[PDB]
């Protein structure tokens, strides 16, 4: 912490970012070293001040060339500020979505998932949750570099099981069947979000389960409906898709095993 | 009161809150924001009671203290306007609640925001004297604030003595408060270790089955209530400091809620 601590006035505020998505998430200069990072800032909640503080407590811990690197903290006073590193190609979605294809190819496709994976696999050992994996939560640095959006990052021992708060609302169409119906959240259940962002990846961002009402998203995957193979995608990260998509959590792979198959694709590629 | 003074007619009244227990309070419905509130009402207790704490509540501003909406001072029914928590008292909410959700990290947390508002009353010179789970309120996202009608400023301080007569909920009272009718930060540093108790067993009752007649000798002679079940020790630590017999002893809110701030950020 102490080390972590920086005084506010190290940092100047340059442009908000997101835009707004994100929330209070603006980029800024870190004046001594000409260098823009990324500054959280705590606006009247927005959330609760202890919740903030615990981001950037959490985040002191992680160090993964593929997890969003904290920098630094202000948290002596308000306002507080949670400092960390700049992506400058901002989120994976939009990035995706508006890339040139020649150059962001199968192969590139391939690299993103195994950057993915790996920061996961880091995770899992580590061991923490993500609970919202999706390709809005990643980041895009120079010549393809990913990283796994960290902030909301909660401690869970790897066979344990977190129950999210009453009346939580998610997003859907990423979420897993047991956290859909009980609010169970757990390594598994990253897995199986990690199944839906490969599916971006390979679309180049569509939108999960086209036209699909989100009210019957839950009775489908019960009667083993599954987004289909997207056009292009190899049969062998199909059936890592599919296999992320198990029912049952325990079925799933662990990210030790998808960063291991990615690992190879990307290595034969 | 300028700006805090509404038309009584501004608002829909409801059914009243909580069963009754608190007792004079209402849900109500702010008709122009759509917002549903607690209205707390004197059709005339002592009206010059009721302006005191209408008053102290204009000054009190903390994202764990229960937020003054609004005031009608003009004429009765006298009405004292505050948002209103959804998930109802702390206390019934622990009892209730599913606790593989409301689970070790969470009631860190809880506490964790409640020695946070105490904290900022200790520092602005009041007292709170009726800390306990039932005067706790839970909003969405285990969100906890403290009810903050009746604080007392210390003007010279930093003993406030009550009226005549007072009678207080003796488990949750300090010693030197049942005593002396004496009350501090530091007597209510000793409520807060009793509310953590009410915590760590989801709203049990402090001191099941003693005779309330018996407690100021117990604790006098050194009896304290033993470890919850499941309760981490570095928790139950600092209930017992909370409980030390010399109130210049206890630690301060400062203090507590630093060690509550590691603790939650840790899991
Ligand atoms: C998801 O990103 C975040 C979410 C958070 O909650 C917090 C805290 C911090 C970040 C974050 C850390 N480094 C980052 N670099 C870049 C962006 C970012 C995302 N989209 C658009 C821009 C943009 O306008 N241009 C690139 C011009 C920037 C966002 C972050
Ligand atoms: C301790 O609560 C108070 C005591 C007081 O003396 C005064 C004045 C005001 C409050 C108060 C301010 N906002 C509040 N929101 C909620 C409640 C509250 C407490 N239990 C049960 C309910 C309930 O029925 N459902 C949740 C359906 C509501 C009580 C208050």
Not at 115 to 144: P, T, W
Request: charged share 25%.
């Amino acid at each position: 912490y102490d080390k972590w601590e920086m005084e506010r006035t190290d940092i100047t505020m340059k442009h908000k970012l997101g835009g707004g998505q994100y929330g209070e998430v603006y980029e800024g200069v870190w004046k001594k070293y000409s260098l823009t990072v990324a500054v959280k800032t705590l606006k009247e909640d927005t959330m609760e001040v202890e919740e903030f503080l615990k981001e950037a407590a959490v985040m002191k811990e992680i160090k993964h060339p593929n997890l969003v690197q904290l920098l630094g903290v202000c948290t002596r006073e308000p306002p507080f500020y949670i400092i960390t590193e700049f992506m400058t190609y901002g989120n994976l979605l939009d990035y995706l979505r508006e890339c040139n294809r020649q150059e962001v190819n199968a192969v590139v496709l391939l690299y993103m998932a195994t950057q993915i994976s790996s920061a996961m696999e880091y995770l899992e050992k580590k061991n923490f949750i993500h609970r919202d994996l999706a390709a809005r939560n990643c980041l895009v640095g120079e010549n393809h570099l990913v990283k796994v959006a960290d902030f909301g990052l909660s401690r869970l021992m790897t066979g344990d099981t977190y129950t999210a708060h009453a009346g939580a609302k998610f997003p859907i169409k990423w979420t897993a069947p047991e956290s859909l119906a009980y609010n169970k959240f757990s390594i598994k259940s990253d897995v199986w979000a990690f199944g839906v962002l490969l599916w971006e990846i390979a679309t180049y961002g569509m939108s999960p389960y086209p036209g699909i009402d989100l009210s019957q998203v839950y009775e489908l995957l019960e009667k083993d409906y599954r987004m289909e193979r997207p056009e292009g995608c190899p049969e062998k990260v199909y059936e890592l898709m599919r296999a992320c998509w198990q029912w049952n959590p325990s079925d799933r792979p662990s990210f030790a095993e998808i960063h291991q198959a990615f690992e190879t694709m990307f290595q034969e590629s």
